[PDB]
Amino acid sequence: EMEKEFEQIDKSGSWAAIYQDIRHEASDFPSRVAKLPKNKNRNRYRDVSPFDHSRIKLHQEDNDYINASLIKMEEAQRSYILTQGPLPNTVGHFWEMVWEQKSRGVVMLNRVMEKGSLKCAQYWPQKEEKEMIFEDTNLKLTLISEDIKSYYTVRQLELENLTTQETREILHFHYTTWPDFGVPESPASFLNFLFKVRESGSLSPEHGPVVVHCSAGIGRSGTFCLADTCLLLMDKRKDPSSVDIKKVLLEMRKFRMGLIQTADQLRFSYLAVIEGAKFIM
Ligand SMILES: CO[C@H]1CC[C@@H]2C[C@H]1[C@@H](OC)CN2S(C)(=O)=O
Hints:
Layout: H1 2-12, H2 15-25, H3 32-35, E1 55-57, E2 65-73, E3 78-83, H4 91-101, E4 105-108, E5 113-114, E6 117-118, E7 132-134, E8 139-148, E9 152-161, E10 167-175, H5 188-200, E11 210-213, H6 220-236, H7 245-252, H8 263-278
Parallel strand pairs: 3-11, 4-10, 4-11
Antiparallel strand pairs: 1-2, 2-3, 5-6, 7-8, 8-9, 9-10
Helix pairs in contact: 2-8, 6-8
The structure holds ligand WUW.
Residues 13-16, 263-264, 267 line the site of the ligand CO[C@H]1CC[C@@H]2C[C@H]1[C@@H](OC)CN2S(C)(=O)=O.
């Protein structure tokens, strides 16, 4: 059981050690499309690339590339699109991807500015009456409503395909309180946030995959998907304690590199799953 494995790693201070074995065992697949010179300005970080096999393709004939990966968790019956925070030049591609994949929710785990630098373009409208038009992808985005709470904001948005005049409602879940350095002290508000996303229906098989991002789409974004998938597997299985976090993380890492960036994020993921298991047993 992970709770006892947790106390062992904690009492022995072996988190950096566990973390390094995960780094060592992690899959390495080609990412040739990401490295083409015509895609250099579509990547926020030169060392964070989607694998070719799992990359999301845009349905535009010119250049189909976006820094985004499909993570397919077969046993849990959950999919997630993990992507980078959009760049000034990729905001239109981001919303095209949301449209094309039939996503119902966007999960944002960063602030636009952290540590005095911009981690993400402002890719949604700040006021009802000031909508955004993405001329490159022929989409219009309107803020419908915004509910600001202490640890997160939920926004209703309307996305309109200007080409076909179809509209969809998108939910934007913005976790606003992740600290600039380290991880939250308690996983309580993160779990509350994850249960709010689940309650919305955004993670349900009726819809396309949820879009999850932070700045790189690997660290906080990884913690989100890893906690959700582990808790779902504990509900589904005859024996809940057969769930090995390290194995689930490695299975996820076949689909996108570098998920869980620090030993701190790994420790936090264990804590979130252990605590969430109480609210699920
Ligand atoms: C990064 O913050 C935490 C993460 C977990 C702990 C303590 C500390 C790390 O020290 C930088 C080392 N690990 S540890 C002892 O398990 O190797």
